[PDB]
Design a protein around this ligand. Structure first.
Ligand SMILES: Nc1nc2c(ncn2[C@@H]2O[C@H](COP(=O)(O)OP(=O)(O)O)[C@@H](O)[C@H]2O)c(=O)[nH]1
Ligand SMILES: Nc1nc2c(ncn2[C@@H]2O[C@H](COP(=O)(O)OP(=O)(O)O)[C@@H](O)[C@H]2O)c(=O)[nH]1
Lengths: 369, 110, 78, 369
């Protein structure tokens, strides 16, 4: 079961190229797309080696890199051009589909800010139209700017069966604190570490979590609550890790409670004490949870690349993410009173408001019904 | 109760639990609190062997009438305690548990 | 728990139980109207019964297991 | 449980700095706040090591000290300036409180003789506003001085949950007797020994007295009579220490009867003869007790710091402490007839009159009602 990636816009193409850089270096694959001599199941992201990428000015910079052998601004301006060359790009997807044994999903890497915003909106609809049987995960990035962001939500709220959030304002704050940058090429480095660690259990053969469905299906309880947030501690027992994850200073976000938590451990820690940390952590009652649905905290081990010490990443589905949406909607309402039908924005305005209520209703003892 | 520092924290954590009747009490829940209590006090700096035997038992009302520690001992050392010292310590531990909650009540009123 | 007969003879009922449910959802594409709902409420009366039945069994080694299921004290309300 | 300490004015900083030096040397803590190699529960007063201090010219001489790595004159002038920086200093306390596991109390070291005394009176009231369930013990030090002394007394009688009196006139006489000094840095040596000895049963855990309320709940009978005095035996059997503390030529205070006594024996004494001595001291009737309610004498052992012999500490509640307020009271009236409303002085003068009236009536067989 192979998963192909899709990169749009400036942000998407820049981080995806670096996402591969971290990925190819994680394995023994030289920049010229060949294995170096110097276990790791590489079927999901590579074909026989060649990566299953579909990329869409900046391509010159990539073609000038040593990796030459590895292969408008309004939402209306982006959506218009995408319809025109619809059949052009869908040839690439089709030829890559049947060339794959059993296609499983469609990772999408783009920023909601400009061509990637509209083109991604066009893609997600058309992707669901032709393919109804394929998971669609997206690595969307958050920041006339508000209008582009709200339109993408309307598509992301019903099309993408999964999602992750990465906000620059919170990411940039981590830069001045622990990296002292004041640069995109620097803040993107964390994204690569975030992205690569996000899919560690897929490439290394393990007992479970051998498919994208094996990961996300635990978090999303209902197709309306399909948003996640991330956490990464190493910037050394398991208890040391889980404590440092849940601190609000480490998460990448700018009453409220969790829905489900996933823990990715990429170290060589002794696995006898892991069930002990949960005991002490549960007693500390350090994190709150929903009272309606039975769920728990997920923890999964891995192994670091020997060709490259304990790390740790956490996947979170927190109802506090509804706060971020409000800011976009709050700003837009200010714009609607500040300046061919202008109704598509109005319908989206409605559907995004529904999601805010669904999260707010989810923290109730009686969210169901 | 010769530690004092550890039993203080242990009486603050069992307060929300033992107030309920005994029917809703299950041993599998209290152990978690007991492990955390050792870490939260100075009893963490201690021999790991003796900490392996210290657990809880449920006497067979209210949660303040069926809780007590056991510290089971088996093997060669069991020839000094002989199942009668363990039937005497628990006979003592009740009187030291009552005279300990009757004091933390009277420092709460104060 | 392969040797422990009671738990191994109760969870086993949970095993083949999902085969029936998963088939029920896959054996059609419409709403559960043609005696599917009539078949749906059959298992929940047994499953939820089998669910809390297991709960009394664990109340040595189960401590590592029951802790995970009881992280949110949901079965405590059962 | 933890206890946050505050240091106000020139006196609070000095006696607090000397309290921490003695408390660091009593433990195994290098001046660089690093643990040296070389049982003693030190989580209450040290944070993982960092002291839980809130210091408020003298700060510079502290920062130029080898312990740098360890972190007008009116009452109205001292009260107002605290109001203008109300939000400022609490952010330091609010983060230290919530950063603390489970807060218990607030130790205050200050001299009531004047910016520090004024600031203290302000902070003592606000702590009652925000935190209702936290004890406030004050290690006040007695000496326009009559004015400032009685004003802070108006707050110390209804805000501070406990109070330990230390007057300079009794300490200076001790320095001109066994110390033979004829300096501030010299008498503070004695103040540090009493303060360090006061919280001895908190740092070395025993069967009893593992919390600050455990020491106070026995002495203070009613919330009004919350004043205590101290006694240092040295400036050996346990029967000698007790008979060397009950003497009036060892108390740090310049009919009447005792309400409750607490004895701290810090030596390596034989703990089997401690119950014997209390059997004899009762027979000689060395102290006269209250007639209305039952009262007794309390002896508690501990262990001296091995990294640094028998010593003693006696905390008593004697109604003869009413005389000290009388001196300040009488001194106030003489200045009131000699020279926007001047009504606060009237209320303070009135409320302390009720406190004195409680003491003189606390020694009668009908103090009940
Ligand atoms: N964090 C991050 N964001 C980026 C980077 N490159 C672009 N972006 C985002 O992308 C948005 C601009 O995209 P744009 O250049 O207009 O895309 P284009 O119209 O397709 O060329 C900005 O809001 C940025 O926040 C990057 O390297 N890192
Ligand atoms: N016991 C004691 N009292 C002190 C010490 N230093 C100063 N004081 C008292 O503090 C008072 C002077 O306060 P001052 O420092 O002028 O107040 P500030 O100028 O507002 O900080 C005097 O009346 C002293 O009794 C000390 O080392 N020990």
């Amino acid at each position: 079961r192979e998963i192909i990636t899709l990169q749009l816009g400036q942000c998407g193409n820049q981080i995806g190229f670096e996402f591969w850089k971290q990925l190819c270096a994680e394995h023994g694959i030289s920049p010229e797309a060949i294995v170096e001599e110097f276990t790791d199941r590489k079927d999901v992201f590579f074909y026989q080696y060649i990566p299953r990428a579909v990329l869409l000015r900046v391509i010159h910079s990539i073609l000038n890199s040593p990796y030459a052998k590895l292969y408008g601004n309004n939402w209306a301006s982006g959506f218009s051009q995408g319809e025109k060359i619809h059949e052009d790009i869908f040839d690439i997807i089709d030829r890559e589909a049947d060339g794959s044994d059993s296609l499983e999903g469609f990772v999408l890497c783009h920023s909601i800010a400009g061509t990637g915003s509209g083109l991604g909106s066009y893609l997600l609809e058309r992707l669901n139209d032709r393919y109804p049987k394929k998971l669609v995960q997206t690595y969307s990035v958050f920041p006339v700017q508000p209008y582009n962001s709200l339109l993408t939500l309307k598509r992301l709220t019903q099309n993408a069966d999964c999602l992750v959030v990465l906000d620059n304002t919170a990411l940039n704050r981590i830069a001045t604190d622990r990296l002292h940058i004041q640069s995109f090429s620097q803040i993107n480095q964390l994204v690569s570490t975030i992205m690569s660690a996000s899919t560690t259990t897929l490439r290394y053969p393990g007992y479970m979590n051998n498919d994208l469905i094996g990961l996300i299906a635990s978090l999303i309880p209902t197709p309306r609550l399909h948003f996640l947030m991330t956490g990464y501690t190493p910037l050394t027992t398991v208890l040391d890790v889980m404590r440092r994850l849940l601190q609000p200073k480490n998460v990448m976000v700018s009453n409220h409670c969790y829905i489900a938590i996933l823990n990715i451990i990429q170290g060589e820690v002794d696995p006898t004490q892991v069930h002990k940390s949960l005991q002490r952590i549960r007693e500390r009652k350090l994190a709150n949870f929903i009272p309606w649905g039975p769920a728990s905290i997920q923890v999964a081990l891995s192994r670091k690349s020997p060709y490259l010490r304990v790390s740790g990443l956490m996947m979170a589905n927190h109802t506090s993410i509804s706060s971020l949406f409000e800011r976009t909607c709050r700003q837009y309402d200010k714009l609607r009173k500040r300046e061919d039908n202008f109704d598509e924005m109005d319908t989206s305005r409605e559907i995004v408001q529904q999601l805010i209520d669904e999260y707010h209703a989810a923290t109730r003892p009686d969210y169901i019904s | 109760l010769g530690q004092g520092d550890f039993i203080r924290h242990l009486m603050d954590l069992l307060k929300p639990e033992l107030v309920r009747p005994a029917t809703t009490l299950y041993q599998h829940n209290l152990t978690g609190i007991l492990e955390t209590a050792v870490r939260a006090t100075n009893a963490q700096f201690d021999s790991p062997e003796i900490l392996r035997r210290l657990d809880v038992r449920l006497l067979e009302d209210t949660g303040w009438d069926v809780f007590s520690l056991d510290y089971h001992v088996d093997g060669p050392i069991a020839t000094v305690f002989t199942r009668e010292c363990m039937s005497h310590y628990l006979r003592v531990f009740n009187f030291l548990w009552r005279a300990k909650r009757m004091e933390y009540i009277l420092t709460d009123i104060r | 728990f392969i040797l422990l007969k009671p738990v191994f003879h109760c969870l086993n009922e949970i095993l083949d139980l999902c085969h029936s449910f998963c088939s029920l959802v896959s054996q059609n594409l419409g709403p559960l109207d043609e005696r599917g709902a009539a078949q749906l409420s059959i298992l929940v009366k047994g499953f939820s019964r089998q669910s809390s039945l297991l709960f009394k069994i664990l109340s040595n080694s189960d401590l590592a297991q029951l802790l995970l299921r009881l992280d949110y004290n949901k079965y405590y309300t059962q």
